[PDB]
Design a protein around this nucleic acid. Structure first.
Lengths: 146, 206, 116, 64
RNA sequence: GACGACAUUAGACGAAUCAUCUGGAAAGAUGAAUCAAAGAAGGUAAUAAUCCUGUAGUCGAAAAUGUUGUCUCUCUUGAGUGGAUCCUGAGUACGACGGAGCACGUGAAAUUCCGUCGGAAUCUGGGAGGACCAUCUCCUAAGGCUAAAUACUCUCUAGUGACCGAUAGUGAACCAGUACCGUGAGGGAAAGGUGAAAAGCACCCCGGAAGGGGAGUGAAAUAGAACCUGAAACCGUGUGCUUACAAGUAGUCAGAGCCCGUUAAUGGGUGAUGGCGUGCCUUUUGUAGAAUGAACCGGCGAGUUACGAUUUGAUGCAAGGUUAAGCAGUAAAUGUGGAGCCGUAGCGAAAGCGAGUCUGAAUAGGGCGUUUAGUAUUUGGUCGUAGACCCGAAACCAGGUGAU
RNA sequence: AUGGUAGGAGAGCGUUCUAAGGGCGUUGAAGCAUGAUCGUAAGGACAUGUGGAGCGCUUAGAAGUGAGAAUGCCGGUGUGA
């Protein structure tokens, strides 16, 4: 381009609304606020969730549960994600990370059975579902619980 | 994708092959605008401030009593409608820079280069041989290659003599292959590159 | 960048003052009273562009009545007989014929008469 | 500053997969002798936060 | 220590160009030029990257010595096993009772204070670690100490910039914490602005002031002490063109006298008559006041981000997500950056299971999911935290000043 | 077939700079204040004065941006006998 003929992409910029600059803008005197009360005032309005003294919704409902502080979460890889590999290749967690299927192996790797495998390989992970091990051994191949 | 390497007398020294991944894309005008806008905003220091009503000198006390006697009720002599001041929402010192993703940035550099190579704005020479700084010498060089007023010359890493030579012909700017930015590529009317430089920029953008 | 309000206020006010020229007293000099008067005079003239059409129709009909009564006719019987005759000319035109060409006006008074 | 989570609401609500907030049932936890056994077991099924309420309480649980 | 460069710091010297024609001059049109580490900006009756100057180069002096690679003295080559007996810290570890700090509302408490208690151990050591006993880490707590890298800039000092551009970073770029006000603590202004050169009206003529003339350095004094010029409006005031039986939101729509035309063509008008006739305004069911508030001008007077959330362009670029900090770069772009941080899977209070799962003792129904699209994303309306559209209390507290 | 103090997505102007391009300018160039043009705008290209050395246009970006009242404040001025 030239620096004297710069042009933004179409529909990518917009001018901001400037409130309180006279009558014909449509936002002239009271500036969009209406006339009086709490919401007309500067710094006004009621804090979110407050409903005027009727008991709020998050006080009239009971608290339930607890949170387990050392819970395990596993990186999930499904069966149709394994078809990017070649037959007979032996997949391991470090190979699954390096190939970029798993970004962040949280507490381990669980293989789940969602897609269709359609290859033959040997896998090594921390956890398998039932259907996953069925479809891995059914095509020929072995699974080994690291 | 072939370009004539000229000598400093401007005749010819050969041809050269430069990628279409770098020098030959369809240039992207949106990413180019976005990167020009970015660089222009990273250059500004936002070194501007005013004094608000709590930072104007003086003015602690209420100037007359609330029910006055025939006067408007006022609270300090430094309120915004008084002539001593207190500014309501002025400038505040801030930064105007922002970032954008890495290979949008490389897309902008490619669009700038490939626009230069499509207006016949690209001249590749073989090496510059300057052993002492002389603007007069460099001026004769830019006359033999038919160059316009604004010209960006890209060496490979650092020629202190061609830097010092070209340094104040007005309109000429001298850069390293690593120091290419969109703003001066777009600002120049033509690009002269050495031979070693064009391989380097073809190898870091491809 | 501070922008100070210079020169634009004075241009905007000075053309309202120049619109108020010929007005009494401090309506041709002072911005607020001259502004209110120029607002009101735009409003008046909007109303009077429409009242002008009623006023001139009324004046033409009064002249036609006077012209018709010199032939022993009302306005109303004349306009009726002119309609039944098929004659379709204005009241602006009828009033100008009655002023200018008296003989022609008598002529179409006769066509209004025998069509009744 | 980061906006703060309303901690009292985060003990009482859980986010579903699309966007909703599964909630716990009121009128539980006390005197059931004035209730039939049908209403005892029908206060056990969980429900969702209604959309009129989501309009009001959306920003309070933005991080959940 | 000769300790081998404080800085090579006072600093100062030290580039290189230019002439001609039309208003004062060129710095407008002609014709030329600059010498290498400067060749880069920027200030001078006319806008010199080549007058003052820097920038480059030069040598560089007091307290200086980069402060070092022998750096006098002088180092400390470590002499290996065991822990068996001794030592390893006293009102103390050690705890009750009132309190405080720890994110934690004192308690079921792992650190501190007051008052009271008291009272260990030694190689078969003892002792200590968010309630108790066995395993893990620690000490040889209290007995004790002491390092650098680790904080921060009135303005110190010098050198610099989409900045303050002078209701200004400042209250004050002028006579400023001064006039002035107050017993005192204290409060706190207004007013800024040649130069082309005073060349500031010699000289000379009529009333003290002020004028009228000439006079002038005057490229221009209606450019005379208001040489920062210098504007407007309010207000004026003296001329005139048209205009004088009445009842008035003063205008508007319907026309005799007098004019005459630029940045040019039903141009430009000017001023006399019959009809019709209620504000920025605000606040109201309703107002035009017998509801509120108001001449002219203006500093000059009412929507950022720390930084988040959510909803509306372009893409690394889509099996996909990196950079935050940091580092290198001209206070930029940019480059690099995995000790590091959203999506591709949901459900359950949870264990857990997983295209399902929860419920159910059922694998049952039914809830919530599945049957592709997101962000390294970055960037254009509304919310949150800020004190958040602006102005305005009565009052509360803390520290002071006052019995003229 | 085509009103709305509250509503969405609109094309535009005064100050500043880039970030540019291209101009008006020391035989004069302003701007600003008095002129026939543009106009819903906000906002700019040719007769007096000014001086006597400063401004526009185009495209885009940033807002001490954004000027009839608040018993508003005042550099303030000046009226109403």
């Amino acid at each position: 381009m030239k620096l004297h003929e710069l042009k933004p992409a179409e529909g990518s910029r917009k001018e901001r609304n400037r409130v309180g600059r006279g009558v014909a803008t449509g936002n002239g005197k009271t500036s969009g606020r209406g006339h009086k009360g709490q919401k007309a005032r500067s710094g006004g309005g009621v804090r979110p969730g407050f409903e005027g003294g009727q008991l709020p919704l998050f006080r009239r409902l009971p608290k339930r549960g607890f949170t387990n502080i050392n819970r395990k979460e596993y990186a999930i890889v499904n069966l149709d994600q394994l078809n990017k590999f070649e037959d007979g290749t032996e997949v391991t967690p470090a190979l699954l990370v390096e190939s970029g299927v798993v970004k962040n192996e949280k507490s381990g790797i669980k293989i789940l059975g969602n897609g269709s495998l359609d290859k033959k390989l040997t896998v090594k992970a921390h956890k398998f579902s039932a259907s996953a091990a069925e479809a891995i051994d059914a095509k020929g191949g072995a699974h080994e619980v690291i | 994708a072939n370009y004539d390497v000229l000598k400093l007398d401007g005749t010819k020294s050969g041809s050269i092959e430069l990628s279409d991944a770098v020098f030959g894309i369809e240039p992207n005008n949106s990413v180019l605008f976005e990167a020009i806008n970015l660089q222009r905003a990273s250059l500004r220091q936002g070194t501007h401030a005013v004094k608000n009503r709590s930072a104007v000198s003086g003015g602690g006390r209420k100037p007359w009593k609330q029910k006055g006697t025939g006067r408007a009720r006022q609270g300090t002599i430094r309120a915004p409608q008084w002539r001593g001041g207190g500014i309501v929402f002025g400038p505040t010192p801030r930064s105007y820079a922002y970032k954008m993703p890495k290979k949008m940035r490389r897309l902008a550099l490619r669009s700038a280069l490939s626009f230069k190579a499509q207006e016949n704005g690209l001249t590749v020479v073989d090496a510059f041989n300057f052993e002492a700084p002389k603007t007069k010498e460099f001026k004769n060089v830019l006359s033999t290659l038919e160059q316009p007023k604004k010209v960006l010359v890209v060496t490979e890493n650092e020629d202190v003599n061609v830097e010092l030579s070209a340094r104040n012909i007005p309109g000429v700017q001298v850069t390293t292959a690593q120091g290419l930015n969109v703003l001066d590529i777009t600002n120049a009317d033509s690009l002269v590159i050495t031979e070693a430089a064009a391989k380097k920029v073809e190898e870091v953008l491809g | 960048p501070r922008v100070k309000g210079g020169t634009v206020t004075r241009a905007r006010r000075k053309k309202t003052i120049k619109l108020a020229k010929g007005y009494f007293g401090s309506k041709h000099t002072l911005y607020k009273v001259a502004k209110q008067q120029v607002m009101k005079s735009g409003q008046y003239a909007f109303r009077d562009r429409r009242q002008r059409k009623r006023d001139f129709r009324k004046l033409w009909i009064t002249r036609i009545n006077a012209a018709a009564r010199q032939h022993e006719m009302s306005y109303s019987r004349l306009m009726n007989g002119l309609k039944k005759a098929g004659i379709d000319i204005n009241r602006k035109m009828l009033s100008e014929i009655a002023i200018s060409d008296e003989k022609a006006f008598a002529q179409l008074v006769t066509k209004a008469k025998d069509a009744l | 500053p980061k906006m703060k989570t309303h901690r009292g609401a985060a003990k009482r609500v859980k986010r579903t997969a699309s966007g909703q907030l599964k909630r716990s049932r009121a009128f539980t936890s006390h005197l059931f002798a004035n209730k039939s056994t049908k209403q005892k077991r029908q206060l056990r099924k969980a429900r969702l936060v209604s959309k009129s309420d989501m309009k009001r309480v959306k920003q309070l649980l933005a991080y959940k």
